From a paper:
Five tubulin-binding cofactors (TBCs) are implicated in late-stage tubulin folding and heterodimer assembly 1,5–10. TBC-B and TBC-E are implicated in binding α-tubulin, whereas TBC-A and TBC-D interact with β-tubulin. TBC-B comprises an N-terminal ubiquitin-like (Ubl) domain and a C-terminal cytoskeleton-associated protein with glycine-rich segment (CAP-Gly) domain.
Limited proteolysis produced two polypeptides, one of which, the Ubl domain, gave highly ordered crystals, and the structure was solved with anomalous dispersion methods 14. The N-terminal Ubl domain of TbTBC-B crystallized in the tetragonal space group P41212 with a single polypeptide in the asymmetric unit. The Ubl domain is a small globular entity consisting of a mixed four-strand β-sheet that forms a concave groove in which a single α-helix is placed. This is an example of a β-grasp fold, a common structure involved in protein–protein interactions 5–11. A pronounced hydrophobic core is present, formed mainly by aliphatic side chains. The residues involved, which have < 10% solvent-accessible surface area, include Val4, Val6, Leu8, Tyr22, Ile28, Ile31, Val35, Thr41, Met46, Leu48, Leu50, Met62, Leu68, Cys73, Ile79, and Val81 (not shown). These core residues are, in general, conserved among the TBC-B family of proteins. The surface residues are more variable, perhaps indicative of a module that does not interact directly with α-tubulin. Intriguingly, and despite only low sequence conservation, the Ubl domain of TbTBC-B contains two lysines (Lys34 and Lys62), which correspond to Lys27 and Lys48 of ubiquitin, and a structural overlay reveals strong structural similarity in terms of the positioning of these residues. A striking similarity is observed in the spatial location of two functionally important lysines in ubiquitin, and strongly supports a biological function for the Ubl domain, and by implication for TBC-B. Through reversible post-translational modification, TBC-B can influence aspects of tubulin biology in a proteasome-dependent manner.
Residue numbers in the entry: 2 to 87
């Protein structure tokens, strides 16, 4: 029902080592929370779900879907791809 993940960011060396999300949470709600750490506007984020073996499960999770749709598990990595322009 809840997962422990880490957060990485495509435009920085910044890592957040432990984060707990509900699998029922929409990806949009997760991006909101992610903003508290990296401060990319959520409209300019894609979330890539990587498993604990480094394998990409989803390159860009849809805002209206829930994290559990993507079969997220403990120790997985949500990588934030930063698309914000100039």
């Amino acid at each position: 029902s809840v997962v422990k993940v880490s957060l990485t960011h495509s435009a920085s060396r910044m890592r957040v080592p432990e984060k707990r999300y509900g699998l029922a949470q929409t990806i949009e709600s997760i991006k909101e929370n992610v903003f508290t750490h990296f401060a990319t506007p959520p409209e300019y984020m894609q979330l890539q779900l990587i498993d604990d073996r480094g394998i990409t499960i989803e390159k860009n999770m849809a805002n209206d879907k829930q994290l559990g749709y993507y079969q997220c598990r403990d120790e997985f990595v949500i990588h934030v791809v930063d698309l914000q322009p100039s």
